[PDB]
Design a protein around this motif. Structure first.
Motif, PDB file in Angstrom:
ATOM      1  N   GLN C  22       0.845  -1.164   0.000  1.00 29.27           N
ATOM      2  CA  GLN C  22       0.000   0.000   0.000  1.00 29.27           C
ATOM      3  C   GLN C  22       0.885   1.220   0.000  1.00 29.27           C
ATOM      4  O   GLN C  22       2.018   1.169   0.422  1.00 29.27           O
ATOM      5  N   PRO C  23       0.376   2.323  -0.519  1.00 32.32           N
ATOM      6  CA  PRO C  23       1.131   3.563  -0.468  1.00 32.32           C
ATOM      7  C   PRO C  23       1.497   3.885   0.966  1.00 32.32           C
ATOM      8  O   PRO C  23       0.642   3.871   1.827  1.00 32.32           O
ATOM      9  N   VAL C  24       2.768   4.152   1.202  1.00 28.67           N
ATOM     10  CA  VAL C  24       3.276   4.472   2.527  1.00 28.67           C
ATOM     11  C   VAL C  24       3.162   5.958   2.740  1.00 28.67           C
ATOM     12  O   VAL C  24       3.739   6.741   1.982  1.00 28.67           O
ATOM     13  N   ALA C  25       2.419   6.352   3.778  1.00 27.00           N
ATOM     14  CA  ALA C  25       2.269   7.757   4.152  1.00 27.00           C
ATOM     15  C   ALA C  25       1.904   8.637   2.963  1.00 27.00           C
ATOM     16  O   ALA C  25       2.330   9.782   2.880  1.00 27.00           O
ATOM     17  N   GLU C 148      10.569   4.159  15.047  1.00 28.89           N
ATOM     18  CA  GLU C 148       9.515   3.214  15.431  1.00 28.89           C
ATOM     19  C   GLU C 148       8.295   3.326  14.510  1.00 28.89           C
ATOM     20  O   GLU C 148       7.798   2.314  14.009  1.00 28.89           O
ATOM     21  N   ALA C 149       7.821   4.555  14.310  1.00 34.40           N
ATOM     22  CA  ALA C 149       6.680   4.812  13.440  1.00 34.40           C
ATOM     23  C   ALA C 149       6.968   4.426  11.992  1.00 34.40           C
ATOM     24  O   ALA C 149       6.103   3.869  11.325  1.00 34.40           O
ATOM     25  N   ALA C 152       7.342   0.522  11.596  1.00 30.05           N
ATOM     26  CA  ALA C 152       6.020  -0.068  11.764  1.00 30.05           C
ATOM     27  C   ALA C 152       5.067   0.284  10.622  1.00 30.05           C
ATOM     28  O   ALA C 152       4.214  -0.518  10.242  1.00 30.05           O
ATOM     29  N   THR C 153       5.180   1.506  10.112  1.00 27.87           N
ATOM     30  CA  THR C 153       4.366   1.937   8.981  1.00 27.87           C
ATOM     31  C   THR C 153       4.692   1.077   7.768  1.00 27.87           C
ATOM     32  O   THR C 153       3.790   0.578   7.106  1.00 27.87           O
ATOM     33  N   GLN C 156       3.188  -2.415   8.195  1.00 24.94           N
ATOM     34  CA  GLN C 156       1.744  -2.417   7.925  1.00 24.94           C
ATOM     35  C   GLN C 156       1.441  -2.346   6.417  1.00 24.94           C
ATOM     36  O   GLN C 156       0.544  -3.044   5.927  1.00 24.94           O
ATOM     37  N   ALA C 157       2.172  -1.486   5.705  1.00 28.69           N
ATOM     38  CA  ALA C 157       1.983  -1.279   4.256  1.00 28.69           C
ATOM     39  C   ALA C 157       2.450  -2.463   3.406  1.00 28.69           C
ATOM     40  O   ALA C 157       1.908  -2.720   2.322  1.00 28.69           O
TER      41      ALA C 157
END
Lengths: 189, 200, 197, 201
Positions: C22-25, C148-149, C152-153, C156-157
């Motif tokens: 998925q597109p990250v951020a 961390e973010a 983890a992002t 998830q993606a």
């Protein structure tokens, strides 16, 4: 009798969060069809279709009403439906509320979670679970929710509180940039 | 005039019941208030919470002071019959401001200032609750027309109509336009009636 | 300078590797390498990932990719012109080899490229490790994310995210505290190979 | 057929894979596949493992290998005659592919083959491509079924002799399912460093 503000253009659901939680906005049943265009509908029957396309073992309803949709139409898919009403007056879910939520999920299959729009109370409780039950950093938890359900938790006090409990309050991210459907205006009709 | 059409899907606004009806006259010039709600909503509003147009004109007769003009900043005519204001000899004008949560624009503010600088008689001003758009426009007028400091205007509104403007972006914008943006106060402490909650 | 049109085997562990995250951020789209039509005799139709598939997805999302960064060390997988003809800028960024994490030079180079830019595509051979690393470096350095973010992002993606343990440790070494590095996830099932096959 | 004398790359993850374990229970010698001199242009001298090298070790021990069991699915890596000419019986045992654990058939086949190297005879050599997973699995099944070892002792013994032993988790699980309690199966060890590959090489 009438539909919630900012609901019509609010996205229906997020991605599964860490393969455990599915965040969504409240479903609205056929009784609201006259107030909602076909392209804006989100009936329970729609949820079960997407699931059929993994099993959701539990749906947790964080809203304070049972007027949005008939719970039976969730349960007739073999989905346990539970209400979990959190402290009101804009407050963050309490230590009691989170303990209730965590113990609830512990009995588990996906777990569905919704409040009215599926961001703030929904994100808060999911992030608390990830930290408390799975030893995530609160940073990973919040960010993972924001990726799965953009923009994620956007209520500043909720972000602040999560880092007070589970991290350093100084490190809480700033409230994120809001998408077009998401705005505060008392005069908007 | 929507006030006289079907009430089927006419609920009263959120946070209105326990929102205070009116502030003190601001600089003896503007009276801020929440929207009135006409008798049509009485089945949804306890007697002790009612705020019909008649209640406002009764207060005005008590102050022994005329209101020349009421500026309505809401986007609907469903709340009360504007004629209940006009029949009392008060000029009624709708001024619909930019939406999507935005601050009243430079156009909105010019329109407001030109409307009011035609009106000793009070000018009433209300949005839904009578704090953010009401306060913004009153403060802009005090600064642009009466050469007040924005510090003085914002504090005066907050004294007259506590807690005053509490939308943080609206406070910052007033200081951007009329002062130093760094000196903008943070949103004030909110009273019990005033809270944000999508599940309430 | 373009080996796609000259004379091999598809990369190992590629067939069942997921095509794209998925597109990250709202900024990055991580993917595995595309393989052009020349490899179709080695890839069943349900496993194909031509450049045209990427641009079909980009038309579907109603979003433009501005730049595609290719971290592989070859030009034989797909014709770069297939990307460039869609108005997508193509650039190869070859990072330090032999298992090494991308260097500070590599990351600085990556950040310089991305600043110009609309999604930015990033692929290595499989789209997890070097792809993850550079995306995470950008997020921390340019957007002031916590590591961390970021890590983890990306997970998830593009699950499980970066799965080389030393890449994970290095990112924490550079952008947080090495002690806070999460442990490497389980090796993905699509990495599985039977050594006697 | 003997593809060693036909047409070509060496197996992946082989160059730094250790050549041979310690003999297991004085009975089995686990190793990776040998590669014949045909592959010398692809293998530096320090990494070569010709059949002749196995023979030299066996002489070094002053011990005989009665039998070599090849679990690979090809004859291209070395000439089987390079084993047989040394008086070592050579046998191919091809196990179920597609990631599967050696079957009940495979194990029976292995056990019956080896029980003749006490019966009519010494070490039994066993190799797959790298000499850990299928090699370890079959050795452990033999130890349990034929020598009445605990599966705990068999798996530990193999890990000691050929570290880290069987490292595919499904193989370990399946051995405990057959021969012990599945909940006692150890988790997979770390993937060995010799397995490391840079995907962009």
């Amino acid at each position: 009798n009438k539909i919630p503000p900012r609901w019509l253009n609010c996205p229906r659901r997020g991605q599964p969060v860490a393969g455990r939680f599915l965040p969504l906005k409240t479903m609205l049943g056929p009784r609201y069809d006259s107030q909602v265009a076909e392209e804006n509908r989100f009936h329970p029957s729609m949820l079960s279709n997407y699931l059929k396309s993994v099993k959701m073992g539990l749906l947790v309803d964080l809203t304070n009403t049972s007027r949005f949709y008939d719970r039976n139409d969730i349960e007739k898919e073999g989905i346990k439906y539970i209400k979990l009403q959190c402290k009101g007056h804009g407050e963050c879910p309490t230590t009691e509320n989170t303990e209730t939520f965590i113990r609830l999920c512990e009995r588990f299959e996906l777990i569905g979670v919704h409040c009215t729009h599926g961001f703030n109370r929904t994100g808060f409780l999911i992030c608390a679970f990830l930290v408390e039950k799975m030893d995530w950093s609160i940073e990973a938890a919040v960010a993972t929710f924001a990726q799965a359900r953009p923009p994620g938790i956007y209520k500043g006090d909720y972000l602040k509180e999560l880092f007070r409990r589970y991290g350093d309050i100084e490190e809480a991210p700033p409230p994120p940039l809001l998408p077009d459907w998401c705005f505060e205006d008392d005069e908007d009709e």
